[PDB]
Amino acid sequence: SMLDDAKARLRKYDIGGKYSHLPYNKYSVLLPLVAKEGKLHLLFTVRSEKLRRAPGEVCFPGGKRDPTDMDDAATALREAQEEVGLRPHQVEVVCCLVPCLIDTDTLITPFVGLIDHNFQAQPNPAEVKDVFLVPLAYFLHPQVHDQINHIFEYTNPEDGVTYQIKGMTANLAVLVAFIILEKKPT
Ligand SMILES: O=C(Cc1ccccc1)Nc1cccc(Cl)c1
Numbered sequence: 001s002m003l004d005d006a007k008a009r010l011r012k013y014d015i016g017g018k019y020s021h022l023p024y025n026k027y028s029v030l031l032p033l034v035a036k037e038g039k040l041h042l043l044f045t046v047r048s049e050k051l052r053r054a055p056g057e058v059c060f061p062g063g064k065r066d067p068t069d070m071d072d073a074a075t076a077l078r079e080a081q082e083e084v085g086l087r088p089h090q091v092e093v094v095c096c097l098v099p100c101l102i103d104t105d106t107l108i109t110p111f112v113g114l115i116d117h118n119f120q121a122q123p124n125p126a127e128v129k130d131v132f133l134v135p136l137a138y139f140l141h142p143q144v145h146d147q148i149n150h151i152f153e154y155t156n157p158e159d160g161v162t163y164q165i166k167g168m169t170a171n172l173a174v175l176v177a178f179i180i181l182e183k184k185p186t
Contacts, residue, residue: 029062
């Protein structure tokens, strides 16, 4: 099946807890995979304009680890619940992808999660201005704009709204798309 195939592909790239005990400032992100209309999608947030760091930027749900978290996956799920109302029964964490090093002292761990088909986002407006889906296949043939660094522009065909996706968020989206969609019979 599509979903069993995606999970099997993802598991091959799982690094597990290999880098998780290293003494960094630790953040986790959840890369939420949603199946709609027979295709996989990634769920993205737009950060609230009122936030002091990266207002209005497209990001995956996530945030800083706190003492309550049993592990890095827990961080991702806690923050996703706070930001978009995703409850733990509504997500299956499939793997941990390569972590992202930034600022010399920070490690961001991405987890891919399969999201329940009955989940409906409840954007928390203190943190999230918007939530939207992008088909995973888009990241194989993105509309690229150079600002010099590469920016993806995705227009939602439902409403014509264009979102800019860049940086770590864009990079991770492409990674997930490659992992899941490469070398597939039509
Ligand atoms: O903050 C993140 C994930 C993240 C973690 C670490 C570095 C870069 C992105 N995501 C998010 C998205 C919407 C609202 C809020 Cl409050 C946070």
